[PDB]
Each structure stands twice: as structure tokens, then as C-alpha cells.
Design a protein around this ligand. Sequence first.
Ligand SMILES: Nc1ncnc2c1ncn2[C@@H]1O[C@H](COP(=O)(O)OP(=O)(O)NP(=O)(O)O)[C@@H](O)[C@H]1O
Ligand SMILES: Nc1ncnc2c1ncn2[C@@H]1O[C@H](COP(=O)(O)OP(=O)(O)NP(=O)(O)O)[C@@H](O)[C@H]1O
Lengths: 559, 560
Amino acid sequence: ESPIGVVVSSRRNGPWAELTLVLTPQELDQGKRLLLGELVRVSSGGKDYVGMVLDGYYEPVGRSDPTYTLALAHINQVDLEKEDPWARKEVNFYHHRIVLLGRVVQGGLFAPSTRLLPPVVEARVYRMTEEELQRLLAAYAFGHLAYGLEEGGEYPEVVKEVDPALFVGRRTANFGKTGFGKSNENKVILTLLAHAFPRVGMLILDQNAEYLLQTEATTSPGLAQAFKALGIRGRIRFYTAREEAWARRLKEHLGTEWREYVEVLPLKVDFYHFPELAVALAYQRRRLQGAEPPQYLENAFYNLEDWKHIPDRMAYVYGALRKAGLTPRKGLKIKYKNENYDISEEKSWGNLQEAMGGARELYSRAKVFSFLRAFHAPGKEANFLETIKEDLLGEKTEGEGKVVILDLPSLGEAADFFTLRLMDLLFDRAVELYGKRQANFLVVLEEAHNFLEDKAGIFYRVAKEGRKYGIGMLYSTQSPASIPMEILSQTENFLVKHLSSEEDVKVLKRAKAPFAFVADFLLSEPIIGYSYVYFEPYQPFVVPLRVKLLEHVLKSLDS
Amino acid sequence: ESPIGVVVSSRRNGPWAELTLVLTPQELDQGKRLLLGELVRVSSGGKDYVGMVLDGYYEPVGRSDPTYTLALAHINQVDLEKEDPWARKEVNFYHHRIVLLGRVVQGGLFAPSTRLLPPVVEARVYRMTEEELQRLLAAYAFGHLAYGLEEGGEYPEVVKEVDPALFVGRRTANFGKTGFGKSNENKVILTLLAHAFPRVGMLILDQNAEYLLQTEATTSPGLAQAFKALGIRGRIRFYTAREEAWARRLKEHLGTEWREYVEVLPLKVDFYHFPELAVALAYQRRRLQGAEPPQYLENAFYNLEDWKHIPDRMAYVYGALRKAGLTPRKGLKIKYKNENYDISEEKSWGNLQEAMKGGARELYSRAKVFSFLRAFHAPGKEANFLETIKEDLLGEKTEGEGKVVILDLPSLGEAADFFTLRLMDLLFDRAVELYGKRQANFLVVLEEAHNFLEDKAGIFYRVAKEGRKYGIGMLYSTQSPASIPMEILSQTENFLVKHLSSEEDVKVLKRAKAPFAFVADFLLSEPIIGYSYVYFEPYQPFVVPLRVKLLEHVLKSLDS
DNA sequence: GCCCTTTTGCAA
DNA sequence: TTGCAAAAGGGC
Ligand SMILES: Nc1ncnc2c1ncn2[C@@H]1O[C@H](COP(=O)(O)OP(=O)(O)NP(=O)(O)O)[C@@H](O)[C@H]1O
Ligand SMILES: Nc1ncnc2c1ncn2[C@@H]1O[C@H](COP(=O)(O)OP(=O)(O)NP(=O)(O)O)[C@@H](O)[C@H]1O
């Protein structure tokens, strides 16, 4: 409980304040060392700061010639330690560099950096204890502090706790090369949130079919299995286009009672039941792809509801839908003029075609509804977009919280349009509902480099304006250089694993200043599960961690 | 009132002169210190300058070895403040570097930089007093000077005040990261202006439904609640397409007397009363698009006034409107040929269509071009919200009344962009027409400015360029300096910058304004909420940190 | 984004 | 039958 060394300098180096430290022969012989990246406590005029050891080098102290002294001692076979204690007391020194991150304020928020530079004769450096480290961090264990693989740098009793106030309404980045634990960390965080704070909903853009169920050895279990193990019931809603296959897999991997944990829903709708929905999708495709809508589509989009009362116009619309190539359910009847036809049968379909208001233009241009074949399935009668919107922002659903997983791969090549439409609809509804209830849901999207780019930027709008409505993002990109700076600069949290490239670390430092002190560690130490966590404004400095395996988390939390 | 240290050097570092300062051990022991970014007064040849503390470092003075001395003292375990004062007295020095921003001359005008380099022997540095700082800032508090979160570096008695000369007629910028106080600062400025100078009109292009009512604990209260607290009556005009819902909210929050503070109007009009408005909107829509509106549309737009006197042409126009989809009110009559139909009924409409020219027939045939107008149509309104807003802002009856206009853009849906562009064009044209008879004297609040100031041909771009002549101000927030063109950034007069994380943002800011080169490190390193770097031209052409105030505290203080 | 084609409808 | 206007899909 005394200073490690003696401070012999200080300065302002860029936007940070440093101070040099010297370790004397006594402290070096006793066995006191300092690991690079360690956190120390600096006292200057009665105040306690937080420092991080950056560098370390050897330099002569006083008027000495260490090279000559050591070379001569080696030549003469003179054992310095046992024979010349007075010669081992004038070369045994060592310098260090320390950077003042900020000052911890009691009952308040960590004050970053410092505008005051301490004189040399009024600064001390004390090693930090476990209680102080816990007070620094804590102010459901998600990981514990650890400095590299060095012995004595592991602190299993210092942990970082998951808290909805850290993730809800704020963007979180997740970087790290392949096989280093991004998905495992995401699963751990989501499981802990769902288990501890059941009032938070999530929307998962499952791009790789790895979240609901995972059985290969190349990754940890999935959310469905985790929920079953933890005892969470009736919180997962799964939307897929392969309902039967996924139900078979779920039954196999969860037993005969899988329906108590997962609700499987289809991504199909009978467009002969929602012609207005079909028109809206066709009209919105143009806007979502840059260009402006045609007038013959604007007119229909605005007037279809009125058209519904004119049987002839409705017959025109249904004929356009059928001519597009959408197979109807067996037993449909049209009423052109005052005669009932059967578009399901080829004979009556041709009769109606030859027997046959803006609906005429729609029938002529019905070659534009062909892209809707992906989402069309006869006899469904369930608007999945409305179902998702109600699940996420229902009046009564407030509180309980729901987890929504979308099986994007099952949608073929329409996944991009479907995701853009869903995001636009959800954000518009959230903006409308402002003041009546907060959205309070978290958007999870892996391979975010794909989604964070478009015309009109639905995801740009979500990232840059979701804070007010409690709409938080948590994206994994695997390479910082692939994310636009316009979105990188708006990210509050960070979770960076090992990054091999140099451009990646340079971009990370450029986007977030405090990440310049760990670039060398990231470059040189390829360790799996080792992450540097940064959280504004509660913990505005980089801290290393050893993330926990999902199996271990489940086993520990079962009790 | 004694020099803090001793000047021991000076030079011309690039375009700025600088000089080094030394703090002696006696002063260091007394407790004197200098904070980075602090403002100090420099005396040289009978003229006082204004300097900023830039850097600080430790360097040995004289023939000494501080490293060896301190290491030996530590080894021998001798307290360095009670046992060996003569050894502690030769290593307790410290250097500072100071930059001269300029000197104030005549009536507060700021002479920039300096062509004269002061000799070391006759240059002194005095700490600046509260009176001097107040004079510096001055020539209804908005924020008090503060140097970071360092205790002892805060001056609650030094404030920057709100004055229409600062804002109206000049462009202001409001940058910062997401969640740091841009909206709160905007609301503070607006509330102070509306409480102090009631002859300044505003136009808030609301985009998130936050400037009228705000109850969620994620932003400061709304302007409606602020006005209710401050006792300002009959000054807010709300334009929205959700009259009933907003009336419910106002009733449930402002109380039962809410109609005194907020006046609600709808964004819907009946186009059967303003066919000229319908045709003008349809014609303007395409021009705001690519270009070259069709000849028939041009002809209709120019000659509808003449058409008004011909019932046959007007019947063709009304038939076109009805065919587009717009619903007329019950009991409408059309005089075609020599007959009076009732287009509100199916059979009458069919008969008229069967019965049915200088340009009206082509419009009737191409009736699908008016479909988009169904996003504004509501039978039985006869309001012309565009004209009403024009009278509210640039009306000749006001000559100073104070009118706060808030537009609920989200309610419109996908027509908000076109509506905003058309309204801005109309307002600017009217203001240009009014030049030489009366000034507009109003401010245009704009949020998410990067959406509007992108294209060089935009009406918002032209307003930003040419509004000062006619008295039209601006105040835009964008969250990122990199998203605004340099052409606008250079010409902007006022700045209010919060924490910025990206190096590109700070580089852009310093490229646009040279004096912002001394605060890049602070911006990058300190993520403080509510901390602002204000720079106002031309009276205060240097960066001064502030501590913006919460709207709740501003209200509670102004009540007295 | 930008630049041609095809089609319909109303002259003549 | 031809010429001209105006809207919407293709290629690059
Ligand atoms: N904290 C950890 N401790 C130990 N092993 C871990 C840890 N995190 C991950 N792993 C191992 O790393 C493997 C890959 O994890 P994974 O979550 O797929 O990384 P990843 O970021 O998703 N790579 P990828 O998503 O394919 O780009 C797992 O199967 C584990 O064996
Ligand atoms: N000067 C201040 N002092 C204390 N809290 C503040 C101050 N300014 C803002 N806040 C708080 O900071 C949060 C964000 O407020 P807000 O003004 O909406 O920031 P913002 O910049 O408008 N967010 P954004 O529109 O995305 O940039 C709220 O909780 C405010 O109460």
C-alpha cells in the first residue's frame, strides 16, 4: 500500500496527458512489475485518477555507462548479484509511460481526460485493488477482467454486468475476424437480457439460420435451445417460408413439446385476400429502388379502397393479379357485369379474359405484379407485416416483451426488399406512436455491411434517429473498414476482438479516439474470446474482458 | 493582480504568434495553476491581448538532473516536502505555451492576430477577472463559461445572452453527437427569444414530433409546455393532419384551458374550392422533379384564370378532378351544356361522363396526374393552409406580433418533402416581393439539415445563400459537419459544436473555420453532455466554451 | 442515372 | 396514314 515508483515527468501529448514513471532497484528486486495495459491509480493534489500503462523502455539514470559496465562484468565472469551489489544498483532501473484516462466522481459520472497537468513532485502511482476495480466497472456476469494470458493478470472476481440501460436505445458494434466469438458474445448478451429483463423486445434479422437452432460443432447452441434450458416459455416468434421442415427440426431437437417455446409462422399471404397490400407493395418497390412511382400506380394506391365497391373494377383488379401469374385458391368467383366466372378453371378464365376507371391500366400493366409470386400462397389470410408490427408495438404487448426472428434465407432474392419494407413500416409506426409508448426493442443484424447501404437510407434513418424512440441496434460486421463512417461515428458501445489488418485498427482509432491504446495488442495477440469493451458515457475507456461460453453461462444460470 | 509566471521565449508559429511561460517553485507551492484552454491576458508594450493556454510540459531548468535527484530521494525514503526543501526547490518548475488570439479595439471590435512579436523581457501574463471576461463575452442567460469538468474552472456569473441581432438574419449551425444537447439548446434559444423579443417570428420544420409536446424522459419538454409555464398566450400555430389526436394530447397535458396557448389547424383543403391551387400544385410537382412540365399543364396553369368565366371549361376541370379520385361534398352541381348535374351521386356522375375545347378536354383525359393530390384533399375545408401560413409569417397586419408556426411533417407521410419545398419557395418569393416595404423578420428552424442542403439548386440552399438580405435567418442541426457542403459551412456565421468523435468531423470543422483548430483535441477526447463551443461573428471571433442550461431550469429561473 | 422504345390518343 | 404529345419500361 505505497507508491510503485517515482514520477519524474509529465506532459500533454495530443489530447491526453502522460507522465513518466521510474522503477528503482529495490522495487525491481522485490518483484514489483507492471504489465502493459494495466490500470493504476494516480493521486495528484488529493484527487484520484485512472491511468493505463502504455509503454516501457530502459534508459540510463544519472552518469552511467550500462553497456560498458555489463560488458566488463560479463567479460571478467563477475557475478553482479553476489559479487558487486554496488554495481547492480546503478544499472537496474526501468522507465514506464502512463496516461490519465479521467477522474471517478462519487455519486456522479466518470469525468473523461483532464485539463490539469500534475507537477512531478506531487504525483504518486498506487496499484489498484480488486474492490477499486469492481467499483470502477460495475458503476448476470458478462465477462471478467484479464490482461493477456499473463499469470497474475486474471481477475475472475471482477466482472462486467449486462444491463438494459446499456443496450436499449443505443447502437453497439461487434468486430473481430472469423472464429473469434462475435456470434457467441451476441448470443450470451441476448440470453442474459431475455432472462433478466423480460420487458425488452428484439428483432433478429437472422441472415445465416444460426440463431434459432445450432447443432454443428462450429458454434454454440441457439436461442431456442437456450430458452428451453433456462425455462423461458412463449417468447419466441419465428417467421419462415419452410414451416414444415422447421417444425420437424424443432420437434426433433426440442422434444414433443416444442410448441411451448417457439411459435412458427409463415411468410406467405393470399394476395387475392389483400389486393390493397399487393398494390402497396408494388407502389413502394419503386420508391425503395430510387425512382418515383408511376401515376397509374399512385392512382390505384390512393383509390383502391373506393374501387372495392365497384364489382367491375374489382374484377379488373383480380384479372390483373391472375394475369400476373398468381395462382388462386380453388373456388374463386368473379362477377364481371352480372355473370359469375371461375378464374380457377382455365375455360372460365379464358371466357372472362375475352369478355373483358383506372383499373384497365392496371390490367394492361399487370406484368408488374410478377415479383409478388415469392410471397403469395393461396388460402393464407394472415398479414405477416401487420402481425410483426403488432407483436413489436402492440398496445397490450407493452411490458411482456417479444422476440421476433426472421428466417431471411428462406425468402430467396426478395429478402432485401422485404427487410427494407419491414424496417420502414416499423419505424413509421414507432414515430407515430411517440408519446403514447416507447418502442423499446433491439434490432440485431449480422453481416451489417450488407444492410447499412441503400438509397434513401432506411437503416441510416434508423441508426441516426432511433435513440428518441428506444430503438437500439446491435450489428456485427467483422471488419470496421466496411461500415460507413456516418454510422460508425454514432455508435456508443464497442466490442472488438482480434483484428489482423492494419487498416481495420486505423479506422477503429479514427472513429473512436480511446481505441488508440489497444491497437498494438489487437494486432499482435490473436486470442479467441478476448474482447475490448467500451461503453459511453458510463465507462468511457477501453477495458479487456474474457467473454464466457454460452454453455458455461447456461450451466451457471440454471441454479 | 500579479503576473502568474515569467515569459521566457516567443516566436511566430505559422500564422499565430506564441510565447512560453514558466511557473516557479514558489508559485507552484502557493497553489497557482493554469488550465488548458484557459483565456489569459497578455500585456506587451501597453496593449492587452487575449491568449489561450495551449500546451504544458515539464522541462528541467538550469544545471540539474531531476530524474537522478528524485530517484535518489525515493531510494533513501526521504519526504520531499519536509526534509529536503533545497532539493525540492530546484525540480519544481513547469512550462506553458500560450497563443495570442488578438486584441480588442475601439467599440469592442476585435483586431485579429498580431503583426508584432513581443520581446521576452517586457511581456507579462495576468489572470483574467470576471469583469474582463464579462466584457469580452458581451462585447436571459444562455450558458455560463466553464473549462471542462475541472472544479474551480467554472464561472456561473459569466454568461452569453440571446439577442435577435445574433440569430435573425444570420445562419447558425448546431453540430454534435447523438444525445448531447442540440435539441435542448435549440429549445432554450427559442424560448428565450419568444419570452424576450415578441416581434420575432419562427417556422419550425418539425420532423420528429418533439417541438410541441414531449413527455418521455428522453428529451426536454415541448415548446407548448414551456409557453404554458412562462405564461405566453396565443402565439403558437400548429399545422397537422391529426387534429383530433393532437387535441386529445393537448387536452390531457396542457389542461382544460389549452386553447389559449396552442391553436390547432389542419393540413387539408378542399380542391373543389381552389382548382387553381390544384393545377398549380400539379404543375410545380414536376418542375421540382426533373424538368420541363408538359405543355398542356403549362397552358392550364397559365389560363385557368381565364377559364374561370366559361362554365363548360370549368365543368371539364371539375370532371377531371372527380375522375382523379377526389371526393366532393354532398350536394354539388355542375353546369355542363345547359344542364346542372350532381357529381356527388353515381347516376349523375355517369350521366355527366356520358355527356362529356381550348385545353380543358386534355386535362380531363389525363386525370390520373391529380391522384397524388388525394393526400391533401378533405371535402368542406376551404382553408388554403399555404396562404394562411403566408399571412401568419409575412402578414402585413403584424408589424410585430410574434408567431410561432410548427408543422407536423410526419403526419403527411410521403408528401412531406414536396410540401416543405413548395412552402419554402412560396415564402421566399413573397419575401422577395416584399423587399423595400418591410422585412420578414423571422427564423427558419431546420433539423436533419443534411437532407435539405444537399442539392445546389434547392430552395433551402438558395435561402441559406440569400436570406440575410431580406432578413430571413436559419438555424440547422445535422449531427455531423461532414454532411454539409463547404460552400455553406464557410459562409455560416455562428457555430455551436458539441462533442464530436470522428476525426473527419473535426478536420472539416477546422478547415471551415481556422479558429476551431485549438479545440479539436478537447472535442475528440471529452464526451461531456451539454458542453458547447460557441463562435459568433463578428464581435466574438474566437471559440469560448459554455455550459448550456436545461429547459426546466431555464423555466424555473425565468418564472421569477 | 442516364438515354432510347413502345404504346395510346388526337390531330389531320 | 402521319405527325406529335405524354407516360412507362429497357440498356448502358
Ligand atoms: N469466449 C469464448 N471462449 C472459448 N471459445 C470461444 C469463445 N467464443 C468463441 N469461442 C470459440 O469460437 C468458435 C466460433 O465462434 P463464433 O461465435 O462462430 O465466432 P464468429 O465471430 O461468429 N465467427 P463468424 O461469425 O463465422 O464470422 C466457437 O465454436 C468456440 O469454439
Ligand atoms: N445541458 C444539459 N444538461 C443536462 N442534460 C442535458 C443537457 N442537454 C441535454 N441533456 C440531456 O441529454 C439528453 C439528450 O437531449 P437532446 O437535446 O434531445 O439531445 P439531442 O442532440 O437533441 N439528441 P439528437 O437529436 O439525436 O442529436 C436528454 O436526456 C437531455 O435531458
